[PDB]
Write an enzyme that holds these catalytic residues in place. Structure first.
Site, PDB file in Angstrom:
ATOM      1  N   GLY A   7       6.825   2.967   3.830  1.00  0.00           N
ATOM      2  CA  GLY A   7       6.259   1.632   4.040  1.00  0.00           C
ATOM      3  C   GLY A   7       7.332   0.560   3.975  1.00  0.00           C
ATOM      4  N   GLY A  13       7.927  -3.638   1.279  1.00  0.00           N
ATOM      5  CA  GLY A  13       8.853  -2.568   1.631  1.00  0.00           C
ATOM      6  C   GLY A  13      10.186  -3.024   2.199  1.00  0.00           C
ATOM      7  N   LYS A  40       9.506  -4.452  14.245  1.00  0.00           N
ATOM      8  CA  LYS A  40       9.869  -3.134  13.707  1.00  0.00           C
ATOM      9  C   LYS A  40      11.308  -2.719  14.051  1.00  0.00           C
ATOM     10  N   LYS A 130      -6.237   2.701  -6.286  1.00  0.00           N
ATOM     11  CA  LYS A 130      -4.985   2.733  -7.017  1.00  0.00           C
ATOM     12  C   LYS A 130      -5.109   3.507  -8.318  1.00  0.00           C
ATOM     13  CE  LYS A 130      -2.676  -1.132  -4.959  1.00  0.00           C
ATOM     14  NZ  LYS A 130      -1.584  -2.152  -5.126  1.00  0.00           N
ATOM     15  N   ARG A 134      -3.121   6.828  -9.754  1.00  0.00           N
ATOM     16  CA  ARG A 134      -2.507   6.967 -11.067  1.00  0.00           C
ATOM     17  C   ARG A 134      -2.917   8.277 -11.741  1.00  0.00           C
ATOM     18  NH1 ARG A 134      -1.904   1.504 -14.518  1.00  0.00           N
ATOM     19  NH2 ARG A 134      -0.521   0.280 -13.092  1.00  0.00           N
TER      20      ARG A 134
END
Length: 302
Positions: A7, A13, A40, A130, A134
């Protein structure tokens, strides 16, 4: 210590990869196959020139990631993928477990502590995604570091650039503090943490005191910069809840976070004196953050 970054064309990123390259660490960028965007190419062009090595894969094709980690001998995996891609890391984690040689994994966190903050939907669901990552990481015995770096230093709009040139929107009573950090400080300190013993299996919280501000304070900084005062209007908690309540991706999600930071104070309502939490300014003493004054400073450029 070879670093894989996923990313790296992302907003965060881009900051982290440059920092790694600037730290003269060996850096591999995971890229999507086939033809590419104009912005990009401007990123891959610059990274490559800075020494970056480009590897081709997707992080949700488990097998591909195994061949990639093994062949290129990767010590450190930093994932910076966007919020729609969070569950795609599940195959990356399975891959890291299989090859068993990983010294540090940074999952895509770069916000608040997802175990402490309780945002409303649809921000809540993102945190569910998320938290689930974890759980998977820890159960897999992978060494980790969670970047809880709070707010990137931009104007904190409800939906989502340049701060307002028309009038100020103040959330609630505007007396609720947040932490603001420059994109470049996020990348540089991120890269420091990766092989620091003191960050092994910890949440890293970015808490620079000089950048601890509420929206009134933050508006005032902006006015010094432009030399004149703009009007201040109140946006209410109810205004925020109504925008979250519409479930519009991703406009509604940003609105949940805005309620969490500026109404409920999620960034500052917890102590970090426990043993699973560490703070950046205390890990790297006498090493200055960029102030909002100088960040906003460059927003005047244009």
């Amino acid at each position: 210590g070879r670093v894989l970054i996923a990313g790296a064309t992302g907003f965060i990123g881009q900051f982290v990869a440059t920092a790694s390259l600037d730290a003269h660490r060996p850096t591999y960028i995971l890229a999507r196959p086939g033809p590419r965007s104009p912005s990009k190419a401007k990123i891959f062009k610059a990274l490559e020139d800075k020494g970056a090595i480009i590897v081709y894969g997707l992080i949700n094709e488990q097998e591909a990631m195994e061949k990639i980690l093994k062949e290129h001998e990767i010590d450190i995996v930093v994932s910076t993928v966007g919020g729609e891609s969070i569950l795609d890391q599940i195959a990356l984690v399975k891959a890291m477990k299989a090859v068993g040689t990983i010294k540090r994994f940074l999952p895509s966190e770069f916000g608040h502590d997802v175990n402490r903050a309780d945002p409303v939907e649809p921000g809540l669901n993102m945190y569910r995604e998320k938290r689930r990552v974890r759980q998977l990481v820890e159960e897999s015995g992978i060494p980790f570091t969670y970047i809880c770096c709070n707010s990137i230093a931009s104007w904190p709009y409800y939906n989502n650039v340049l701060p307002p040139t028309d009038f100020f929107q103040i959330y609630g009573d505007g007396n609720v503090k947040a932490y603001f950090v420059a994109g470049t400080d996020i990348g540089k300190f991120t890269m420091k943490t990766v092989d620091d013993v003191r960050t092994l299996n910890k949440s890293v919280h970015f808490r620079p005191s000089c950048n601890c501000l509420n929206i009134n304070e933050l508006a005032s900084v902006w006015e010094k910069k432009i030399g004149r005062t703009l009007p201040r209007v109140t946006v209410t908690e109810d205004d925020l809840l109504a925008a979250a309540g519409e479930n519009i991706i991703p406009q509604s999600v940003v609105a949940a976070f805005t309620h969490d930071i500026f109404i409920k104070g999620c960034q500052v309502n917890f102590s970090i004196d426990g043993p699973e939490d560490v703070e950046v300014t205390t890990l790297y003493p006498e090493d200055s953050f960029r102030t909002v004054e100088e960040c906003f400073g460059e927003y005047i450029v244009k």
